[PDB]
């Protein structure tokens, strides 16, 4: 009953994560574009959900006991807005706690995204990588 009882439930946490993104009223006034991949050519500031680089290779399965979700945000302004888009997406992510209908997973990962201003004239973008673990998933 507890072998690989996730599968569609783990990816449905991305739907529950999309439910904190749709339930969080301050984020929608900041983006016109919270979408699950389509709308990459839509107006700035805005966000698409997926993965970064050549992360899923041959299979799209994050080892065994893990659920993985990445968010890619292009605001395109200055240093304060990159912390506001990144803090607004994580503030949504724990605004309403992550549960799916009989299934619990906890956000347990170590990452960093740095906000910087360069002399060469670079854009401000936020790349967010989140992993949720079923190991001690109390719920």
For the terminal residues, how far apart are their CA atoms? 16 Å
Strand content: 15-25%
Count the E strands: 7
Write out the strand line-up for the largest beta sheet, numbering strands in chain order.
Answer: 1-2-3-7-6
Which key features would you list for this structure?
globular; STM4215-like; 7 strands; 139 residues; monomeric; Bacteriophage SPP1 complete nucleotide sequence; viral protein
Explain how this protein is built.
The protein is an alpha+beta fold and 139 residues long. The protein has one domain: 2-Layer Sandwich (STM4215-like), CATH 3.30.2000. The protein is 22% helix and 22% strand. Strand 4 (99-100) and strand 5 (103-104) form a beta hairpin. The longest helix has 16 residues, at 8-23. A 5-stranded mixed beta sheet has the order 1-2-3-7-6. A two-stranded antiparallel sheet has the order 4-5. The chain starts with 7 loop residues before the first helix and ends in a 6-residue tail after the last strand. Keywords: Viral release from host cell, Viral tail assembly, Viral tail protein, Virion. One of its GO terms (cellular component) is virus tail. This is Tail completion protein gp17.
